[PDB]
Amino acid sequence: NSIAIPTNFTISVTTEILPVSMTKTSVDCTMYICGDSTECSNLLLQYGSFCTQLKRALTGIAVEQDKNTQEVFAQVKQIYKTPPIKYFGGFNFSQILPDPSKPSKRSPIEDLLFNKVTLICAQKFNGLTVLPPLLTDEMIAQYTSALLAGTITSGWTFGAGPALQIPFPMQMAYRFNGIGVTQNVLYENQKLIANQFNSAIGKIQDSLFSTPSALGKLQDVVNHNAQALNTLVKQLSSKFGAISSVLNDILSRLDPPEAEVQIDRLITGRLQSLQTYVTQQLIRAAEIRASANLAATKMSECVLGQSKRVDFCGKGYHLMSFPQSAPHGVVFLHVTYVPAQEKNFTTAPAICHDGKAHFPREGVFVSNGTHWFLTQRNFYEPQIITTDNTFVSGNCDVVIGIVNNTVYDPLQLELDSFKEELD
Amino acid sequence: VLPPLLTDEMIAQYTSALLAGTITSGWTFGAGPALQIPFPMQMAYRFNGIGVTQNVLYENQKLIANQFNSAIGKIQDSLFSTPSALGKLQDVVNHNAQAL
Amino acid sequence: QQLIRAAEIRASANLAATKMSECVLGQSKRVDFCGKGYHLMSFPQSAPHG
Amino acid sequence: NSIAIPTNFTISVTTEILPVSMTKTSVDCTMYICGDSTECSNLLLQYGSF
Amino acid sequence: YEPQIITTDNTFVSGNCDVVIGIVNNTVYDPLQLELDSFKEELD
Amino acid sequence: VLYQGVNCTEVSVAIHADQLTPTWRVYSTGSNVFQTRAGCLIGAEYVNNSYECDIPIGAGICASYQTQSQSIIAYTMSLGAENSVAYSN
């Protein structure tokens, strides 16, 4: 018969970082294997359409990466704007909203994320090029801004139909009902909640600013693709059994009948290097696709709604989420309600009054040692146990652990006062 | 072959912690501090979750506990008597052994 | 082949972690996600490699 | 105008088995290709950083 | 949109009027009290 | 056509000098050569009117065949219609 019930709460903001896209690469198979060498190219033709398959695999990856970015961020039909007066019940969103004074119009947090993670082929000029993404960083920031403005001014309604404006504190009140806490808890404590939110956001900036490893998930993607390309270029210096790694030297010193042997050895080595590179890129692309699909699911369920999936949208009971753009990925700020300062109370499954078994409609019966009250499960708020708060099913001889207490009938009390005097 | 970082005992300890949390605190340990609740009341809340009132559980608490205990015994009999029950894990072991 | 199987295992592990969070540390209203029927509760058990 | 309503219920327990981890392997590339052979290792070096 | 009269059946009470920000003044209709003033309006 | 990763000046010079390896040529007249981050786009007139993306080019630029007779145009793609929500207390 012992139950603990939170008497306070904390608004917590946590960060989830997910890759969305990968560097899009393109390889000129002939230049890589047989750079500016007719004799090598003519020998390369005897291996069939391998360069063509490699071209399709890399093109398919590049297209998929643009699909992944589009699927994660372009989830809003319209580009929403916040009002000129950025007052939302006392909730300060200035560190997640676009900063209009800076070029690129990114929020302070997005600018930090872009500064922490690190067109002309100056490097790796061996047939290996990088294609730009279809959406620019500014376009991604604009989608993020639209999603954020939608959530702040319209709540969850913009994600399932037209955007419907609602005062922010009432949006929060609905989110509180979602987790299972009544609206009056929010309204009575609105200033406390706004202050806890603002503090948590400041902590997010301090955490990202002071922790170099915070964005490791995105940096690892950048590092792995850079390493893959550096390895692919390094394989060109290998001899693979040939007298020289340079085709110009082989053609310069040897007659065609010998050069073809040395060239074929190099063609085999370079072709194997390209197949290894492309296979690894296909595997990483599949991994990124899975991550992007998770990010898109989280965008739809955490940002454009309220999720009741445990730990899906941060640790704690989910209230709301806000997206932020990051290089090659997305960062979600998950705002949750965390119970705090629980108190230890006596409980019972039912109250026995006049032989009837009374069960709570929305809550748990608790006792502060001497008196029985009905409370909401997630926030201590004792109320008198009445026939409005409970329902009756069966008698007192069935429920195990039933305790004896008065249930107050609101109407019967009137019957004994309204005509107490008879006349 | 490199050993795993967590030993079988450590995994068993995590499983035990998760089970003790669920049994004594219900769903509250997964979203904040663990809050104790009597088990039949946890079940009552779970019944409200599916859309059945609390009195159904309390009136039939003994029946429900007996059905649960019987079902667990059946789980042990099913796993004990069916060699193929764990095929999903054995296939992973067999495929990596075959690859090597 | 090990990279491909590793990706398959990763997907399985991600599903298992999702199920741990939603079935064991909560109550799920997703149909057939946490067993057949209306979900009440789940209990994890350790197994070799799973 | 016909509806069916359960008058009883069954508590059912089912089992879901998921892989979580794979055997962790490590390969000494040089020993496998060129086991304890200097001549082979020196030839192996010509294939680059495979 | 389906407007209904605000009554004690539709709302719940928690605290006083000096805590909630943006509270407005309006009548909440008590369904039972109206009967108390009609059922024995005449006293006899 | 799009010449990837190159400055339009370098392409124009390579065309003038008869150095460019592919032997076909695109008319390359005034206002049909547009510099993008993806590369040098030749054969499409750039306009300041955004539209939904049709054929992607890159770095925010898409091209489409439009009536303006009809010709291929390049534009910065639109992300969506603007809707300012009437938020209030």
Ligand SMILES: *[C@@H]1O[C@H](CO)[C@@H](O[C@@H]2O[C@H](CO)[C@@H](O[C@@H]3O[C@H](CO)[C@@H](O)[C@H](O)[C@@H]3O)[C@H](O)[C@H]2NC(C)=O)[C@H](O)[C@H]1NC(C)=O
């Ligand atoms: C919403 O929160 C932000 C902070 O997250 C508040 O920004 C405040 O902006 C003012 C003016 O830019 C800052 O004042 C000055 O900052 C510099 C450092 O940049 C400092 O050296 C000066 O002494 C002075 O403090 C102020 O510090 C900054 N607040 C914080 C906490 O850093 C913004 O005002 C808040 N908006 C609303 C509507 O409450």
Ligand SMILES: *[C@@H]1O[C@H](CO)[C@@H](O[C@@H]2O[C@H](CO)[C@@H](O[C@@H]3O[C@H](CO)[C@@H](O)[C@H](O)[C@@H]3O)[C@H](O)[C@H]2NC(C)=O)[C@H](O)[C@H]1NC(C)=O
């Ligand atoms: C529930 O918890 C919150 C904290 O999460 C409690 O509010 C906190 O109350 C303490 C004590 O009243 C405040 O500390 C004081 O702050 C002032 C700020 O000027 C300072 O001058 C004092 O010396 C002292 O440190 C604290 O700031 C306040 N926190 C917030 C975020 O408002 C709240 O009272 C608790 N409620 C219950 C019912 O116990």
Ligand SMILES: *[C@@H]1O[C@H](CO)[C@@H](O[C@@H]2O[C@H](CO)[C@@H](O[C@@H]3O[C@H](CO)[C@@H](O)[C@H](O)[C@@H]3O)[C@H](O)[C@H]2NC(C)=O)[C@H](O)[C@H]1NC(C)=O
């Ligand atoms: C709802 O279904 C349950 C079964 O899931 C019914 O309970 C079962 O009732 C039968 C008949 O009363 C019990 O069988 C008897 O069991 C005793 C055990 O000692 C045995 O000696 C008798 O010969 C007979 O087999 C059965 O055990 C019992 N099962 C459980 C799990 O309690 C229940 O009555 C049904 N309720 C309604 C409202 O129909």
Ligand SMILES: *[C@@H]1O[C@H](CO)[C@@H](O[C@@H]2O[C@H](CO)[C@@H](O)[C@H](O)[C@H]2NC(C)=O)[C@H](O)[C@H]1NC(C)=O
């Ligand atoms: C349990 O709660 C009741 C009700 O809040 C407490 O009794 C009240 O105490 C206040 C003083 O704090 C009195 O003014 C009220 O008249 C009391 N009400 C009743 C119905 O007796 C009670 O003291 C609390 N007990 C414990 C152990 O915390």
Ligand SMILES: *[C@@H]1O[C@H](CO)[C@@H](O[C@@H]2O[C@H](CO)[C@@H](O)[C@H](O)[C@H]2NC(C)=O)[C@H](O)[C@H]1NC(C)=O
């Ligand atoms: C709740 O109150 C009822 C009625 O006062 C108690 O029921 C009585 O319990 C005594 C126990 O010795 C019996 O002898 C009486 O015959 C019972 N009366 C009735 C009308 O049922 C009940 O025990 C009380 N429960 C608790 C938990 O104190």
Ligand SMILES: *[C@@H]1O[C@H](CO)[C@@H](O[C@@H]2O[C@H](CO)[C@@H](O)[C@H](O)[C@H]2NC(C)=O)[C@H](O)[C@H]1NC(C)=O
């Ligand atoms: C709602 O009604 C109450 C009571 O009529 C108003 O409260 C009064 O407000 C005036 C404002 O000048 C005060 O001088 C009185 O002392 C208050 N009386 C009481 C009993 O509190 C309240 O202002 C009204 N609210 C609105 C929004 O109009």
Ligand SMILES: *[C@@H]1O[C@H](CO)[C@@H](O)[C@H](O)[C@H]1NC(C)=O
């Ligand atoms: C809860 O309260 C009871 C007394 O009502 C006390 O004996 C018990 O120790 C308390 N629980 C804890 C965890 O201390």
Ligand SMILES: *[C@@H]1O[C@H](CO)[C@@H](O)[C@H](O)[C@H]1NC(C)=O
């Ligand atoms: C192209 O070259 C000119 C100088 O000839 C330079 O001013 C311009 O910025 C370059 N453009 C690009 C896109 O590199």
Ligand SMILES: *[C@@H]1O[C@H](CO)[C@@H](O)[C@H](O)[C@H]1NC(C)=O
């Ligand atoms: C909302 O109320 C605040 C109270 O300070 C006020 O500053 C703000 O201008 C009001 N907003 C609107 C849209 O009237």
